[PDB]
Design a protein around this ligand. Structure first.
Ligand SMILES: [Mg+2]
Ligand SMILES: [Mg+2]
Ligand SMILES: [Mg+2]
Ligand SMILES: [Mg+2]
Lengths: 98, 78, 24, 60, 127, 206, 155
RNA sequence: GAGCCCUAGCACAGGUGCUGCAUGGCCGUCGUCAGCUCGUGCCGUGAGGUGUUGGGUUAAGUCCCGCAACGAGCGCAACCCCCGCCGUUAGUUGCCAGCGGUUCGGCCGGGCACUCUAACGGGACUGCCCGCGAAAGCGGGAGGAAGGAGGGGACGACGUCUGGUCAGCAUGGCCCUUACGGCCUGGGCGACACACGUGCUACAAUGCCCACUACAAAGCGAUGCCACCCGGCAACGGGGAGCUAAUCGCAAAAAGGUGGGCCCAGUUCGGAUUGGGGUCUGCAACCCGACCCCAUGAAGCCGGAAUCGCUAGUAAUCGCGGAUCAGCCAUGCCGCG
């Protein structure tokens, strides 16, 4: 039972990047428990638009950490093939656990 | 307001304790108005800076526990 | 109410806890 | 002064109380968002360029 | 044996489960009148029944979670209604007239900058 | 003074970031300060190349710098003795292993940040603003573009009175999100003061 | 209201007598959106109408209101000079608005310490037709008559 | 006399020194107002006009009909985000929903149904009916979570105010260069006879107090949140488990509901002011920190002339979080419900 966390600012290249990680584990391992979407940690910034004294009117900036999760029940190396380096994630991260 | 020391300045004490072997000087001028007036080292007169000058403050028993700044007021006509 | 340190309401408003509003 | 100052804010000083922030570009004291070492202006600036990643136009 | 409709109203969601026969109503492992204890309006949540005639003749087991009480009262009011249309496509033409069937979109409008409060605007002094 | 930065406005669609690397509260801050002083030195000692974008990707001790230009042969050297010194200037301050790709703009008259840069250039060589603007737009409009526009701010022709010339062609639907509008801002230090150049070029759709 | 006529906002029937007029009156009792506390009051007060008279509350209620509706009132008006209190017929929707508003105001003018009582005794004093609400209502009606001389300006 | 570092010179540094009326950039504003234009033709000696005007209609120069104009551009609308309904994908957050074991806490096997989480789609079009209309469209009815811009954002034309800012930054000029630079310690920005703006807390019984009583809705936390123990009336101090956090913590939601108290009083309203004892952060709390507990309990009984906000989940009212941040003078602001 290999279980993996994936963070990302980019909601597209996760459901993308870490869901090829479901082909290369059903095609090369056995049973998968599909992609699970963890709720998001949304850091927000509120910024006064002008250099000087314009306290009403500012603009809203968010920085949104998306969180996806993957479970597979197959600690063999018929899997750990693609699933070590066979890349398409460029602004992503990995948590590796069992 | 603390209870683990009386956060009084080294540079001042050093100068009082070392005056405490026959020492009766007025010429004593500090800048640490932040330092607590400490149990019994009284008799003397300390010139406390108010930001513009030091002030001849005589120090008595009834007035321990208080800081030095309390006796050297910093602003004018009040 | 909200102005009185020594009420429940006082404490809530002020953020604090104490004798007049404990932490259970 | 703002130089002898941009400089002084870099020395780890006697007592950490004296340790302040400073917009790392727009070399500046106030409204310094800690997650970016960035002054609210020199900040709205880079954000607009996309030179701070994931950072975006918020709207709800 | 079992019947379901989901109600929502403003952060609050209702799990409704209708069962045939009776009259009693659980909400969150608690009697109705124990959950909505002397809150004048609660008697409203079951008004969908009163309108069909199943005033009593149904049991109800209920989960209810989300923000706050008076919403939940309405949340249920939809569940109940939705649940019993899925025990009768013929339960349309009487429930829709009083429309216990419309979700009701009205949420907290959002706090805007420069205002104090979404619409309430700061205090002008002119002179 | 109204009007949003039309890149900022487009980051969701129609425009990606110039730093695509992930992180977290702990080192995002410096993965920025470094990240910048990079495109810092790059922009200065690479001007002659003429650099449009300068993307950056990361993944811990690697950093895929991708300097876009239209003069690639100026980043390079002879066989490669500039591009050699530079991948070495990068790792000089950056305690890291610096990948340093190069790209080319097939058409530098569709790269607003150059079009602006161009016009700025002319200005410092006491040129003729109204015309420069006039030409630049044309140049761009010539090379296949679906509309475009350029603004010089003020102190035109050394004038005591600051003013603001601008010319436009085709479309520039600045309110349409699905536009794809390269924007670029050239500066322009002159003997009597700064002017400011803004270039817009419209391409996209559906 | 420059564009439209604005729909008479439609109210949710009384969950206890089934009357829109009642909710209306409950709302006028309400302070800072404490609708719960408000209904307690109205009902506790209907309690105090049995406990004191033979007849049905909904009936005292309907009636108290009826007596408090004004039929004419003065509306102010611009003329070449200063202003004119111009008497004119008071529209049904407003009659209702004013009645309820006045009942609640008059109620909280009374001396008794607990709200449901005040509401009740005022409701009672009204159907009998002698509350301070029916007072500040004959004041209007009378005042529209005082000014009967200017009734040739009504728009 | 390679580099480095010292003292003596030198070229220079430095300047939050002046000019926003030399400037860039960015902002405010009329104003999300329904406008401002151009190309060609046409009319006029010409400035210019026509177009854009008119009649109908829109939230709109929105569209319709008409017309010496016919078309375009920056606007408006739409393309993006959030909130309503439904579907697909997906199972450490959902449950007896169904059954079994439950130390009776979804806790345990077990399942994703449902709730949710988050990605992607569907859905609304004046498409349908009746009436009026030449048309656009208007009024009404159906069905539908939603109906005629369903609700809230982001988004600010040509220009205007020689608006704002040289103290964020960039910059031309100008000016000081053992001092208009720099360093430190202390004071100041916290002064107080007065006067205004914006707020907070009240003046009470639709109220105040004390008790018991899950209805959760955004966000933050590994030099942190800190459960839970014990000491203390408490602030807080010991200890001390868990969480790189849909898993652990901040966290009590408060208004509410139930019970009891107060009984119309300057009060069991109100908590200013002052005396005292302490806690914490910090090198350090006199000037000048917040917090706890004892005492002290002020003006205030709803406010002259004036005057501000808001059209619906709005106003009113009740809490919750965050940014800066050692601590905090936040009753401020940005957000949640
Ligand atoms: Mg100006
Ligand atoms: Mg300017
Ligand atoms: Mg000025
Ligand atoms: Mg001026």
């Amino acid at each position: 039972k290999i279980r993996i966390k994936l963070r990302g600012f980019d909601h597209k290249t996760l459901d993308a990047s870490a869901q090829k990680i479901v082909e290369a584990a059903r095609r090369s391992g056995a049973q998968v428990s599909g992609p699970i979407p963890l709720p998001t940690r949304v850091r927000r910034f509120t910024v006064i638009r002008g250099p000087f004294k314009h306290k009403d009117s500012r603009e809203h900036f968010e920085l949104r950490t998306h969180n996806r999760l993957v479970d597979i029940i197959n600690p063999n190396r018929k899997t750990i093939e693609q699933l070590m380096t066979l890349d398409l994630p460029t602004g992503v991260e990995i948590e590796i656990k069992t | 307001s603390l209870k683990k020391g009386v956060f009084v300045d080294d540079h001042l004490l050093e100068k009082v304790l070392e005056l405490n072997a026959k020492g009766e000087k007025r010429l004593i001028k500090t800048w640490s108005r932040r330092s607590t007036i400490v149990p019994e080292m009284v008799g003397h007169t300390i010139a406390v800076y108010n930001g513009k000058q030091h002030v001849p403050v005589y120090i008595t028993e009834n007035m321990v526990g208080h800081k030095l700044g309390e006796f050297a007021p910093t602003r004018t006509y009040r | 109410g909200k102005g009185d340190r020594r009420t429940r309401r006082g404490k809530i408003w002020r953020g604090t806890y104490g004798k007049y509003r404990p932490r259970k | 002064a703002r130089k002898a100052l941009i400089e002084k804010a870099k020395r780890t000083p006697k007592f950490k109380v004296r340790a302040y922030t400073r917009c790392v570009r727009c070399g500046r004291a106030r409204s310094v968002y800690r997650f970016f070492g960035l002054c609210r202006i020199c900040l709205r600036e880079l954000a607009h360029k996309g030179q701070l990643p994931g950072v975006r136009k918020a709207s709800w | 044996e079992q019947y379901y409709g989901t109600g929502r109203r403003k952060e609050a969601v209702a799990r409704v489960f209708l069962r045939p026969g009776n009259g009693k109503v659980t909400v969150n492992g608690q009697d109705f009148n124990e959950y909505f204890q002397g809150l004048v309006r609660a008697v409203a949540a079951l008004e969908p029944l009163r309108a069909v005639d199943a005033l009593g003749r149904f049991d109800a087991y209920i989960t209810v979670r989300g923000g706050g009480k008076s919403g939940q009262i309405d949340a249920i009011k939809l569940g109940i209604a939705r649940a019993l249309v899925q025990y009768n496509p013929d339960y349309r033409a009487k429930l829709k007239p009083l429309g216990f069937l419309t979700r009701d979109a009205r949420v907290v409008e959002r706090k805007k900058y420069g205002k104090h409060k979404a619409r309430r605007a700061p205090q002008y002094s002119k002179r | 003074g109204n009007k949003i930065h039309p890149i900022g406005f487009r980051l969701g669609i129609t425009r990606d970031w110039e730093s695509r690397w992930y992180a977290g509260k702990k080192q995002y801050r410096h993965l920025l300060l470094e990240d910048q002083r990079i495109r810092g030195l790059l922009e200065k000692e690479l001007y002659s190349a003429g650099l449009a974008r300068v993307d950056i990707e990361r993944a811990a001790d690697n950093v895929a710098v991708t300097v876009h230009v239209a003069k690639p042969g100026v980043v390079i050297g002879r066989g490669g003795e500039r591009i050699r010194v530079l991948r070495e200037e990068l790792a000089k301050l950056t305690g890291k292993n610096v990948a340093l790709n190069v790209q080319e703009v097939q058409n530098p008259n569709l790269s607003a940040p150059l079009v602006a840069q161009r016009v700025a250039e002319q200005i410092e060589r006491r040129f003729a603003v109204r015309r420069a603007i006039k030409q630049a737009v044309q140049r761009v409009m010539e090379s296949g573009a679906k509309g475009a526009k350029v603004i010089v701010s003020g102190r035109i022709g050394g004038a005591e009175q600051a003013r603001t010339e601008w010319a436009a062609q085709g479309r520039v639907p600045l309110h349409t999100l699905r536009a794809n509008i390269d924007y670029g801002f050239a500066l322009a230090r002159t003997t009597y003061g700064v002017l400011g150049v803004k270039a817009y070029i419209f391409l996209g759709e559906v | 209201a420059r564009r439209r006529r604005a729909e008479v906002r439609q109210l949710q029937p009384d969950l206890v007598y089934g009357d829109v007029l009642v909710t209306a009156f409950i709302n006028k009792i309400m302070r800072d959106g404490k609708k719960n506390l408000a209904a307690r009051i109205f009902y506790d007060a209907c309690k105090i109408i049995q406990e004191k008279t033979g007849q049905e509350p909904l009936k005292v209620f309907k009636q108290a209101v009826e007596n408090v509706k004004p039929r004419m009132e003065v509306r102010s008006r611009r003329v070449g000079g200063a202003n004119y209190q111009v008497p004119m017929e008071v529209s049904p929707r407003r009659q209702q608005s004013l009645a309820l508003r006045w009942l609640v105001q008059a109620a909280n003018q009374r001396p008794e310490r607990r709200a449901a009582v005040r509401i009740a005794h005022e409701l009672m004093d009204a159907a009998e037709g002698k509350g301070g609400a029916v007072k500040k209502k004959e004041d209007v009606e009378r005042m529209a008559e005082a000014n009967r001389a200017y009734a040739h300006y009504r728009w």
